[PDB]
Amino acid sequence: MVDYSVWDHIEVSDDEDETHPNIDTASLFRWRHQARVERMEQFQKEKEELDRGCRECKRKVAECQRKLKELEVAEGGKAELERLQAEAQQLRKEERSWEQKLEEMRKKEKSMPWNVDTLSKDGFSK
């Protein structure tokens, strides 16, 4: 019942800004390589997922739509609710899932364990 005001409601300003340079001598090279690798695996992952979910979604939605659309013309009283339910639910779920999965995908990828390095592996797949 009670909300979970703490995972963000605490208001932290998104934890500092998007900038915060702090180099000296070796930190430059270290941060350079680490940075490139970070955005590399991050952008690469989010990318593959984007194109993958985009093509997959479009494909399914396309076929499904054409189906419920071609059938929507066929007789069937209560059938109207069946087609409207499956359809409305199909898109609503596709957009809702993509939206959520997206926010989380970027929210996690942006703070991935590889970004900071110095730790064990997580079975990352390419």
DSSP string, 9-34: TT--TTTS-S------SSHHHHHHHH
The string over 41-51, giving b where at least 16 C-beta atoms fall within 10 Å of a residue's C-beta and e elsewhere, is bbeebeeebee
Long-range contacts of 58-61 (CB under 8 A, 24+ apart): 60/90, 60/94, 61/90, 61/91, 61/94
Which experimental approach was used here?
A: NMR
Q: Are 83 and 89 in contact (CB under 8 A)?
A: no
